[PDB]
Amino acid sequence: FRYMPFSPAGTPFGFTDRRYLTMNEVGYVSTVKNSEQYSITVSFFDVGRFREYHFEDLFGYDLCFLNEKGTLFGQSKTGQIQYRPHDSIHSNWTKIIPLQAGERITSVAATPVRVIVGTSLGYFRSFNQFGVPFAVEKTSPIVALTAQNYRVFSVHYSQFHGLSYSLSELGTSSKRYYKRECPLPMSLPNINSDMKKDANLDYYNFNPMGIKSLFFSSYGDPCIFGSDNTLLLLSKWRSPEESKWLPILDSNMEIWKMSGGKETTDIHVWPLALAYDTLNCILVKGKHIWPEFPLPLPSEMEIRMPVFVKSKLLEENEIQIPVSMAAEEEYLRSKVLSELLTDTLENDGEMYGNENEVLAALNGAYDKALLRLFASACSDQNVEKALSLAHELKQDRALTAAVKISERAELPSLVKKINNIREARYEQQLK
């Protein structure tokens, strides 16, 4: 297996002379073949904040990572890296990473406060924003890195384990692991023999693992987006025995729904970032599944739990979703986000300053969606299913709503049982 230089949302040259080195919510970085050298351009989506600039690359940077304070560049073969702060306050700095025979830099990452370099031999080298080195660590061969503030999400690959991941924090003194080389259940690309003349084969030669991008969400949860075009989010990562990967968006299904229930072959999603409940992306129209020049305007795609079936969606008819059917997904989606956000606040606290209100509204949508399912169960005379739903309610005022719905459905036995839940919770509350 050949380790290829990886960068988030990077594209191959393909049959052209230009490509994107990396790409996210901050902006995009492209490189163009300039005879015997290269022209690197760093562009931003917030043109008001930052000013697009460009420079000449005499080294052949094939690795990149972009954050809000600077841009990191890497050369996979010579091991040369360079960090370029956006603002003139701090100077650019260049470093040469030690590389053994055949050892390549496979991925680089940078936050405003940390710089990380991973190699094909599993060497994990970290620095601060000024180039002051941390201890050098040996891990499994690294294929992908991303970072946010002081935390690093790394993907490893061997011919032994397959794909694994680590989740760590780069403290003042040393590296602490939240999760160390746990299984990474991302689907790998299934390349065929007819793919040898396929138009998109060039991508999987450029990116064998099919990791289109990976990142922390805005609230700090690890995400990954592979060739199956499904956004995977890591849940409960602070509790090693509870950590689970959750599929929270099937972009193929969303495109299908956007197209009014029609199968397409010319619309693709390129993942940039996840902001709370919305996937920031590029909608790629064309033969190739990666974006090209000029770059389209970023789109927004709300996450949806993959619980919808195409056949049932067609019967109930952009595709229209019946309120009862939409309630199941909304309950599940709220349940996941509420659980994630709660863990964040109880451990890290607020980050932007409105999370508690976000969480509060979230829990409101949760109970509200749950009550709709409750009503439907009441409608179908299903007292048992309704009672199970009522147990999943959060707010006591929501329990009250359940009682009123039960009364309107003329189910007095259900009313007493729900009132018992209220009583049972009051007892536990006094302990």
Binding site: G364, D367, K368, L371, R372, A375, C378, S379, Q395, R397, A398, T400, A401, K404, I405, R408, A409
Partner: peptide, 13 residues
């Protein structure tokens, strides 16, 4: 069964 009126009461809280 319509519960829109019951849901509205829960929102105002």
């Amino acid at each position: 069964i319509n519960i829109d009126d019951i849901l509205a009461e829960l929102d105002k809280e």
